[PDB]
Amino acid sequence: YKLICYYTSWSQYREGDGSCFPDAIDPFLCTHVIYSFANISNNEIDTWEWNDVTLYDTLNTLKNRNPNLKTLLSVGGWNYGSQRFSKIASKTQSRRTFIKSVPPFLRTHGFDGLDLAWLWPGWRDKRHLTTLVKEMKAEFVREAQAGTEQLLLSAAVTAGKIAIDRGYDIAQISRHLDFISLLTYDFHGAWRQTVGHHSPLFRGNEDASSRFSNADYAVSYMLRLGAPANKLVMGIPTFGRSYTLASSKTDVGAPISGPGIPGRFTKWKGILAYYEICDFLHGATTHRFRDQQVPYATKGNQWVAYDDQESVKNKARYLKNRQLAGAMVWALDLDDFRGTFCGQNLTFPLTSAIKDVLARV
């Protein structure tokens, strides 16, 4: 079973104990560590941060400790225009340039493959995504002839039905792709004007309007679209999402003034790391959607949906049962990587729980 874990570049800037470098990653924790993100420039893959060449190095030296560790490099992310990606892919010449740029760069910096994070394609883009995957893989096949082990190619895929139908030929891309990481953590946002969970496993017959907005739909549906189970990797968030409440209503349907306040360390409105969440839980009221099998918490005018060790195990079992290739984690830097915030003296609580479960019968 794969354990695909994402590291974010920009986690290096958070103050104090928030600062995460590739240093902190235990090299027997994951099977694949993916480095986000790379920039494209003159139609060629490129660094993003000023010191990625160093952080690249620091991550790829972990393979000294675990010779079996596979590392990849992710291109795009949200930071970065779909507009821009589309422009590069829809022309045969920029596409080619970008594809040829990729292996030499990967090799130079010691990566084992590429993750495409095009977030996300439009309906006009679906045709070019397929071609790009196809052609990129053919390139990885042709470079394998040179005696180095064949590069891996993977893709980050949105778990929302509307988005999958708009932007992805799943059946086709599944052939050329080594695995697909399904982003089953986005099933809600602050654009809905109430409370709700964003990673729920099941719809939970609290009240389908979306019966589509849950991990299980997303998984059935990708299999139904023809993603082999053995290429499919279910995404499990390590962060939580916060919402400022608009009243003392707190259950399902409770209205929302907007996103919750910034976390002390992550400093983004609407998001918290698990380590910031473990601290929030002190003096909060805890609840668990029975149906959807995920927890929330609330205190003051703050309401938080999150994943904890139990829900994360539970998702790990679900995917074993479903016979999928593994789990995908977003993200290491947002898990309790120092192991000091959540009571126990365990680092990467959330990710270890998955890993333990992935090793059971």
Ligand X SMILES: *[C@@H]1O[C@H](CO)[C@@H](O)[C@H](O)[C@H]1NC(C)=O
Ligand Y SMILES: OC[C@H]1O[C@H](O)[C@H](O)[C@@H]1O
Q: 330 is in the binding site of which of ligand X, ligand Y, none (Cβ under 5 to 8 A by kind)?
A: ligand Y
Q: Which of residues 116-135 bind ligand Y (CB under 6 A)?
A: 117, 119
C-alpha to C-alpha distance for 360 and 101, rounded to whole angstroms? 41
> How many CB atoms lie under 10 A from the CB of residue 298?
22
Q: Min. distance of Cβ 41 from ligand X in angstroms?
A: 4
Interaction between residue 51 and ligand X (CB under 6 A): no
> Coil, helix or strand for 227?
coil
Q: Min. distance of Cβ 360 from ligand X in angstroms?
A: 42
C-alpha to C-alpha distance for 354 and 359, rounded to whole angstroms? 9
Residues binding ligand X: what is the number (CB under 6 A)? 3
Q: Per residue in 255-290, is it b (16+ CB within 10 Å) or e — as a string?
A: ebeebbeebbbbeeebbbbbbbbbbbbeebeeeebe
Provide the residue type at 236 as one letter. I
Interaction between residue 164 and ligand Y (CB under 6 A): no
Interaction between residue 41 and ligand X (CB under 6 A): yes
Encoding tokens for residue 155? 């893709």
Q: Which of residues 29-58 bind ligand Y (CB under 6 A)?
A: none
Q: 83 is in the binding site of which of ligand X, ligand Y, none (Cβ under 5 to 8 A by kind)?
A: none
Question: Could you say which of 186, 206, 279, 291 contacts ligand Y (CB under 6 A)?
Answer: 186
- Among residues 161 and 287, whose Cβ is nearest to ligand Y? 161
Alpha-carbon Rg for the chain, nearest whole angstrom, is 20
Interaction between residue 330 and ligand Y (CB under 6 A): yes
Interaction between residue 61 and ligand X (CB under 6 A): no
How far from the centroid of its chain's Cα atoms is residue 206's Cα? 27
Interaction between residue 39 and ligand X (CB under 6 A): yes
Encoding tokens for residue 233? 């990797």
**Which residues form the interface with ligand Y (CB under 6 A)?**
78, 117, 119, 156, 183, 186, 330
**Which residues form the interface with ligand X (CB under 6 A)?**
39, 41, 48
